[PDB]
Amino acid sequence: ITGRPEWIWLALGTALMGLGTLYFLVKGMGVSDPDAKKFYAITTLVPAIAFTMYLSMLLGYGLTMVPFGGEQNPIYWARYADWLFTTPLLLLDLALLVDADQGTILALVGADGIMIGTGLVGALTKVYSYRFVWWAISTAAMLYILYVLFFGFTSKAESMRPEVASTFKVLRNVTVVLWSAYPVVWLIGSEGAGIVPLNIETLLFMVLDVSAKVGFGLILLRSRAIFGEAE
Amino acid sequence: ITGRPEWIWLALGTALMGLGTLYFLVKGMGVSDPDAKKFYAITTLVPAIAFTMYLSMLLGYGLTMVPFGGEQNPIYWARYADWLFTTPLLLLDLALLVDADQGTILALVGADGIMIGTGLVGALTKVYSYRFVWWAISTAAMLYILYVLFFGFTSKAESMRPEVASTFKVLRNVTVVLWSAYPVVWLIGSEGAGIVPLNIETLLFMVLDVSAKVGFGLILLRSRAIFGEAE
Amino acid sequence: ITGRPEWIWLALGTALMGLGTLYFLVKGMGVSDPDAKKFYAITTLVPAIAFTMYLSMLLGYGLTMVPFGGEQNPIYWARYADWLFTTPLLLLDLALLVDADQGTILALVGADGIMIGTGLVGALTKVYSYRFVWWAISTAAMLYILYVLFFGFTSKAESMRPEVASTFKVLRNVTVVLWSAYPVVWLIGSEGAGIVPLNIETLLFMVLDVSAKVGFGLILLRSRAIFGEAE
Numbered sequence: 001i002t003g004r005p006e007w008i009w010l011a012l013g014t015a016l017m018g019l020g021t022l023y024f025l026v027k028g029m030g031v032s033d034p035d036a037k038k039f040y041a042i043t044t045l046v047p048a049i050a051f052t053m054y055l056s057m058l059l060g061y062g063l064t065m066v067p068f069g070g071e072q073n074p075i076y077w078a079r080y081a082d083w084l085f086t087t088p089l090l091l092l093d094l095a096l097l098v099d100a101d102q103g104t105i106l107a108l109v110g111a112d113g114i115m116i117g118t119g120l121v122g123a124l125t126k127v128y129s130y131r132f133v134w135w136a137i138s139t140a141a142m143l144y145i146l147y148v149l150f151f152g153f154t155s156k157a158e159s160m161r162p163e164v165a166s167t168f169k170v171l172r173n174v175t176v177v178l179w180s181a182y183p184v185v186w187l188i189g190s191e192g193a194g195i196v197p198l199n200i201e202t203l204l205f206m207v208l209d210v211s212a213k214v215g216f217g218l219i220l221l222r223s224r225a226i227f228g229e230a231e
Numbered sequence: 232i233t234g235r236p237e238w239i240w241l242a243l244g245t246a247l248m249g250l251g252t253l254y255f256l257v258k259g260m261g262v263s264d265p266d267a268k269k270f271y272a273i274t275t276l277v278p279a280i281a282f283t284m285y286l287s288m289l290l291g292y293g294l295t296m297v298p299f300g301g302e303q304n305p306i307y308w309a310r311y312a313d314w315l316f317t318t319p320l321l322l323l324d325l326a327l328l329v330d331a332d333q334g335t336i337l338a339l340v341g342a343d344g345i346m347i348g349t350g351l352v353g354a355l356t357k358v359y360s361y362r363f364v365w366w367a368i369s370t371a372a373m374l375y376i377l378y379v380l381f382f383g384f385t386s387k388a389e390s391m392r393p394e395v396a397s398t399f400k401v402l403r404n405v406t407v408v409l410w411s412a413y414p415v416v417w418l419i420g421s422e423g424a425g426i427v428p429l430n431i432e433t434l435l436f437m438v439l440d441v442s443a444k445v446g447f448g449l450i451l452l453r454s455r456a457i458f459g460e461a462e
Numbered sequence: 463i464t465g466r467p468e469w470i471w472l473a474l475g476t477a478l479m480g481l482g483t484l485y486f487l488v489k490g491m492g493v494s495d496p497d498a499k500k501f502y503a504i505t506t507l508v509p510a511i512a513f514t515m516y517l518s519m520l521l522g523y524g525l526t527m528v529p530f531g532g533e534q535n536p537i538y539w540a541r542y543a544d545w546l547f548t549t550p551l552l553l554l555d556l557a558l559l560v561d562a563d564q565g566t567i568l569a570l571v572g573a574d575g576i577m578i579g580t581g582l583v584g585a586l587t588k589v590y591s592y593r594f595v596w597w598a599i600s601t602a603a604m605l606y607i608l609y610v611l612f613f614g615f616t617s618k619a620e621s622m623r624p625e626v627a628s629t630f631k632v633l634r635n636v637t638v639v640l641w642s643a644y645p646v647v648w649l650i651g652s653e654g655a656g657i658v659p660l661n662i663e664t665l666l667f668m669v670l671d672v673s674a675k676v677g678f679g680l681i682l683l684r685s686r687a688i689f690g691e692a693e
């Protein structure tokens with residue numbers, strides 16, 4: 001484990017995702033509202049999945065070597081197995097908050113799968129220049145997601161209860177800022193141009209992951225928007 | 232790329248799926264009917280997924296070598312990753328058109344997963360004679376799907392609006408004819424008996440894919456069956 | 463095939479899953495109740511999936527070698543591909559029986575995916591002591607599932623029709639007893655401590671699989687709880 005300088009950030013990430021999972025699990029014990037139960041189930045699964053994948057990276061299972069640039073490059077593939085399941089769950093939290101229609105939910109989840117799937121292909125591609133073709137396709141899929149979150153959901157939240165509109169607006173802004181950083185870290189990190197070393201890259205993804213999952217969840221599950229209007 | 236004679240058909244397929252995706256995306260911009268939005272989302276995702284997998288084959292990522300018959304045989308595995316997601320989406324288009332019940336939808340999607348999954352196992356199997364055992368199981372799963380589309384959905388469409396009944400009947404006939412060709416191309420192509428060479432096999436799958444996805448989508452999204460009855 | 467002593471139990475399992483699939487398929491022909499159709503579709507898919515994965519193990523495709531303990535250990539990975547899809551389908555049978563809320567269904571299916579996913583990682587892990595870390599995480603996920611089936615569903619079934627309450631109680635008890643045996647067989651078998659040899663381990667999993675899928679299905683599909691109350 002300790003033979004890799006980035007191990008400290010993988011261990012911290014593992015701990016923070018595990019602690020986040022347990023807090024949400026305990027906090028959700030005393031909840032019977034069927035609407036609130038939906039948000040607790042979605043939001044608790046997110047850091048639980050991330051916990052297992054951070055642990056796999058810490059123990060060395062989620063790491064492979066990819067030859068490109070005449071070098072064997074360490075690629076943590078477990079990140080994409082994490083994101084494949086956690087990013088659509090996070091979008092479902094937002095879509096259920098605004099009572100989005102089914103067709104829009106399917107478009108979001110499908111574009112998200114394309115985003116993560118093409119990012120994985122780009123991470124494992126051995127022809128250096130082709131890695132950035134996949135990065136560009138994946139980034140186009142992300143821009144579609146961000147467009148929908150702004151010019152489809154925002155207008156839908158305003159016609160909703162005030163507390164669900166204000167909570168959505170906050171979580172929307174958090175998501176757009178944090179998610180946009182991921183393609184940048186990829187491009188300048190060891191998967192892309194190799195400007196930033198792997199140990200610093202790992203620290204950046206850990207800060208982003210914890211903020212986008214645990215921080216996101218703390219804002220959502222403390223809001224009254226997750227409960228139905230009741231007397 | 233150009234070192235493979237089949238590259239021209241992979242490049243054409245990539246272009247036609249990309250163009251198809253963009254047309255459906257633009258055409259769906261001016262749509263607010265929640266029913267129509269469902270069909271546009273399903274139908275636009277189909278060629279978008281196929282685009283990415285054709286590109287992976289063009290660039291050489293979606294290709295592996297499988298030893299059988301005393302030879303290293305080029306097997307494009309990316310086809311099955313495509314079909315795993317696009318064939319159930321196409322069946323969902325048909326099932327939603329006739330307002331099929333949930334139990335029937337699950338049976339269709341499950342049989343479809345078995346069809347594609349066993350076809351993938353057959354494509355990667357190293358014992359030559361066993362490849363055709365998997366082909367037979369996969370073909371049995373397809374025949375179940377075709378039976379349901381005829382002796383379960385057809386009777387359901389007649390009790391529906393006339394425009395949804397006539398549109399379903401057309402898309403049903405297109406699907407049964409085109410899908411039935413796939414097991415035949417597999418059997419006589421490089422995955423099976425090896426009668427037809429890979430470059431011709433690739434041309435045939437490209438014609439079938441574009442027809443079953445883009446051609447299918449053009450018929451559906453030009454129909455009024457996708458809109459609810461409104462004044 | 464016959465070069466492996468466990469082949470006899472893989473062949474028996476294949477036959478019993480295939481026969482089970484055909485019986486459920488025939489029995490479900492004469493069913494039009496939309497509620498009953500749901501249970502028949504879920505319950506017939508379970509042994510059909512298991513059939514294909516037992517066949518892959520029989521023919522040698524679903525087997526790999528994992529080095530640990532200074533030895534190349536035969537690991538049947540196809541079991542986890544089976545369980546990944548069949549265990550959530552079995553939980554869906556139970557959840558639909560008691561009309562569970564959506565949030566609870568998602569929590570069950572998500573915990574089940576974590577259970578199977580971490581068990582697969584543990585089966586393929588090359589550092590011997592780490593294999594049991596994954597076993598423990600997977601077992602914690604199972605205990606969560608069992609808790610929900612007892613202290614969330616049981617109370618919900620009592621407020622239901624008497625026949626659905628008594629049928630659920632029976633299937634609940636069958637599930638908790640049979641599922642609990644799996645982590646024990648893993649721990650003492652070739653994936654874990656290696657006390658029980660592989661051929662005996664394979665026999666035990668076959669008895670458990672057939673009972674948990676075909677036996678489970680025979681109890682459910684003979685009950686009147688799967689039909690709506692009708693005159």
Ligand SMILES: CC(C)CCC[C@@H](C)CCC[C@@H](C)CCC[C@@H](C)CCOC[C@@H](CO)OCC[C@H](C)CCC[C@H](C)CCC[C@H](C)CCCC(C)C
Pocket residue numbers: 084109110113114117118120121124276280283295308311312313315316351
């Ligand atoms: C509606 C939305 C959900 C739609 C989703 C969008 C999606 C279509 C976007 C594209 C996804 C696609 C790129 C997934 C590729 C997975 C692949 C990286 C797995 C590893 O295989 C890659 C190479 C080794 O580098 O295999 C070496 C050769 C091996 C012999 C490969 C044989 C196994 C194949 C991988 C079998 C295909 C399985 C499916 C891809 C499983 C789904 C994986 C997940 C990442 C989507």
Ligand SMILES: CC(C)CCC[C@@H](C)CCC[C@@H](C)CCC[C@@H](C)CCOC[C@@H](CO)OCC[C@H](C)CCC[C@H](C)CCC[C@H](C)CCCC(C)C
Pocket residue numbers: 315340341344345348349351352355507511514526539542543544546547582
């Ligand atoms: C309700 C419906 C959706 C049900 C679906 C029906 C489905 C059950 C039908 C059978 C599907 C099954 C054959 C999928 C097999 C995937 C497999 C080809 C992936 C590549 O692995 C094959 C060998 C190399 O040749 O791995 C070499 C050895 C490696 C060490 C393998 C270890 C990884 C395992 C593959 C882990 C299992 C992952 C799941 C199979 C992922 C789903 C893939 C998709 C193709 C279903």
Ligand SMILES: CC(C)CCC[C@@H](C)CCC[C@@H](C)CCC[C@@H](C)CCOC[C@@H](CO)OCC[C@H](C)CCC[C@H](C)CCC[C@H](C)CCCC(C)C
Pocket residue numbers: 045049052064077080081082084085120546571572575576579580582583586
């Ligand atoms: C809501 C719920 C459904 C959530 C589900 C819970 C889930 C997150 C729990 C953890 C699942 C995770 C451990 C799955 C790992 C699959 C992995 C074993 C496949 C084989 O790859 C392992 C190594 C060889 O030993 O690959 C060698 C290196 C290769 C180069 C690997 C590159 C391919 C990657 C495997 C791509 C990721 C694909 C996804 C993991 C596909 C889903 C598989 C299924 C088992 C979940």
Ligand SMILES: *C/C=C(C)/C=C/C=C(C)/C=C/C1=C(C)CCCC1(C)C
Pocket residue numbers: 083086087090115116119120135138139142179180182183186209212213
């Ligand atoms: C909890 C994890 C989250 C919210 C991860 C989000 C990840 C992304 C938005 C990743 C995007 C990428 C691109 C847009 C292209 C480059 C490759 C990716 C996958 C890093």
Ligand SMILES: *C/C=C(C)/C=C/C=C(C)/C=C/C1=C(C)CCCC1(C)C
Pocket residue numbers: 314317318321346347350351366369370373410411413414417440443444
């Ligand atoms: C857009 C792609 C489509 C509609 C693909 C359809 C593919 C099939 C219907 C494939 C069927 C197969 C068999 C029936 C057995 C032989 C292997 C397959 C997977 C080619």
Ligand SMILES: *C/C=C(C)/C=C/C=C(C)/C=C/C1=C(C)CCCC1(C)C
Pocket residue numbers: 545548549552577578581582597600601604641642644645648671674675
């Ligand atoms: C039809 C198959 C069924 C119902 C299989 C159930 C399997 C389990 C409940 C497996 C549980 C495991 C653990 C709890 C940890 C050890 C590894 C597993 C996956 C065997």
Ligand SMILES: CCCCCCCCCCCCCCC
Pocket residue numbers: 181184185195196197200
């Ligand atoms: C979206 C965030 C990207 C900003 C990356 C900042 C990295 C600064 C760290 C110093 C770079 C290390 C280079 C010298 C080793």
Ligand SMILES: CCCCCCCCCCCCCCC
Pocket residue numbers: 016019020023210211214215218
């Ligand atoms: C009462 C609110 C705080 C509860 C404690 C939460 C502990 C989980 C770890 C959170 C750290 C990361 C927060 C986002 C920066």
Ligand SMILES: CCCCCCCCCCCCCCC
Pocket residue numbers: 412415416426427428431
């Ligand atoms: C379902 C369509 C299958 C028909 C295949 C027709 C192939 C004819 C092309 C000529 C065969 C090439 C053999 C000589 C190289």
Ligand SMILES: CCCCCCCCCCCCCCC
Pocket residue numbers: 247250251254441442445446449
């Ligand atoms: C107005 C209808 C035609 C629009 C142009 C569609 C261009 C997408 C490519 C379609 C070619 C394949 C059609 C099926 C044979």
Ligand SMILES: CCCCCCCCCCCCCCC
Pocket residue numbers: 643646647657658659662
């Ligand atoms: C949950 C069931 C686990 C019980 C396992 C009993 C196995 C007894 C078979 C004899 C053990 C073989 C050891 C000598 C070869």
Ligand SMILES: CCCCCCCCCCCCCCC
Pocket residue numbers: 478481482485672673676677680
């Ligand atoms: C009339 C009920 C029996 C029908 C025959 C079922 C045959 C399928 C194989 C069942 C054997 C396994 C039963 C569970 C132990």
Ligand SMILES: CCCCCCCCCCCCCC
Pocket residue numbers: 084085088089092102105106109113
């Ligand atoms: C490729 C993996 C995608 C599945 C991720 C799991 C979450 C799915 C959310 C589905 C939302 C409901 C759509 C109607």
Ligand SMILES: CCCCCCCCCCCCCC
Pocket residue numbers: 315316319320323333336337340344
């Ligand atoms: C194995 C991958 C299957 C999933 C394909 C994605 C489409 C799923 C459609 C689900 C239809 C809704 C069923 C109720």
Ligand SMILES: CCCCCCCCCCCCC
Pocket residue numbers: 139143146147150180183184
């Ligand atoms: C185009 C939709 C408007 C909202 C999206 C904001 C774009 C942020 C740019 C992200 C940069 C990634 C490289």
Ligand SMILES: CCCCCCCCCCCCC
Pocket residue numbers: 370374377378381411414415
């Ligand atoms: C048996 C259901 C009737 C409709 C299915 C038509 C069968 C077409 C044969 C396809 C040939 C594939 C080898």
